[PDB]
Amino acid sequence: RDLKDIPEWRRIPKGENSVAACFGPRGGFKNFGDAEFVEKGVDASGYAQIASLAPNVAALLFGGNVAVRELADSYEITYNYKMTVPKSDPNVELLVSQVDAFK
Amino acid sequence: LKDIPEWRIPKGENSVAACFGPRGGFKNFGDAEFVEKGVDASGYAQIASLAPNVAALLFGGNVAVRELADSYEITYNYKMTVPKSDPNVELLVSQVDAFK
């Protein structure tokens, strides 16, 4: 298979084809991840803890907003999923400290 | 269910309404049979092929954080474009804002 065959929403960054190859540079929108997560992807120290604070597909569809804009040849879907984690959670900061890390 | 972080798998007894509440302006996805059968609904696996995994959610979309006194409010914003040639995009699109 080839990374170009896999659509972006199904990619998993790992090894040779990691975040830069899957999602492009960090930026204002794609803002999560410091230098070491950008390079190791799901292998970065802390990822598994972080990933526990992100919704599965069933929660994405039923527990958040799904919005559609129809184009000529396509549909553009935007998922907007909000959630609250108590500061007593042992993994919240790991996530937060990775937001907007690009410097 | 009260000890399962909402962000839960809806099936039979504990389905959409119990996990995520009624459909509304924000939680706007799902028709009468999807609200009732949850992940058991006809077509769910097809809709599901057009929704991102966690690694794609964290690295391929926007992550926003608002700090409160005793919690953080996290917001994921994931954009994606599906070709109309995909056999499942209406299956999905027809479920958007389904409530009537």
Swiss-Prot record, chain A:
In which compartments does the protein localize? Virion; Host endoplasmic reticulum-Golgi intermediate compartment; Host Golgi apparatus
- At the top level, the lineage of the source is Viruses
Instruction: Provide the leader sequence positions.
Output: none
Q: Where is the composition biased (Basic and acidic residues)?
A: 1-6
Segments forming domain CoV N CTD: 1-103
On modification after translation, the UniProt record reads:
ADP-ribosylated. The ADP-ribosylation is retained in the virion during infection. Phosphorylated on serine and threonine residues.
Region annotation Dimerization: where it falls in the sequence: 5-103
The record describes its quaternary structure and partners as: Homooligomer. Both monomeric and oligomeric forms interact with RNA. Interacts with protein M. Interacts with NSP3; this interaction serves to tether the genome to the newly translated replicase-transcriptase complex at a very early stage of infection. Interacts with host RSAD2; this interaction inhibits viral replication.
Q: What does this protein do?
A: Packages the positive strand viral genome RNA into a helical ribonucleocapsid (RNP) and plays a fundamental role during virion assembly through its interactions with the viral genome and membrane protein M. Plays an important role in enhancing the efficiency of subgenomic viral RNA transcription as well as viral replication.
Protein family per UniProt: Belongs to the alphacoronavirus nucleocapsid protein family.
What name does this protein carry? Nucleoprotein
From Swiss-Prot, chain B:
Q: Which cysteines are joined by disulfide bonds?
A: none
Which residue intervals make up region (Dimerization)?
Answer: 3-100
Q: Domain of life here?
A: Viruses
Please report the PTM annotation for this entry.
Answer: ADP-ribosylated. The ADP-ribosylation is retained in the virion during infection.
Domain CoV N CTD span(s) in chain numbering: 1-100
Location of this chain's protein in the cell:
Virion; Host endoplasmic reticulum-Golgi intermediate compartment; Host Golgi apparatus
Task: Name the protein family.
Answer: Belongs to the alphacoronavirus nucleocapsid protein family.
The annotated subunit structure for this chain is: Homooligomer. Both monomeric and oligomeric forms interact with RNA. Interacts with protein M. Interacts with NSP3; this interaction serves to tether the genome to the newly translated replicase-transcriptase complex at a very early stage of infection. Interacts with host RSAD2; this interaction inhibits viral replication.
Q: Describe its function.
A: Packages the positive strand viral genome RNA into a helical ribonucleocapsid (RNP) and plays a fundamental role during virion assembly through its interactions with the viral genome and membrane protein M. Plays an important role in enhancing the efficiency of subgenomic viral RNA transcription as well as viral replication.
Quote the protein name from its UniProt record: Nucleoprotein
Phylogenetic classification of the source organism: Viruses, Riboviria, Orthornavirae, Pisuviricota, Pisoniviricetes
The gene from which this protein is expressed is N
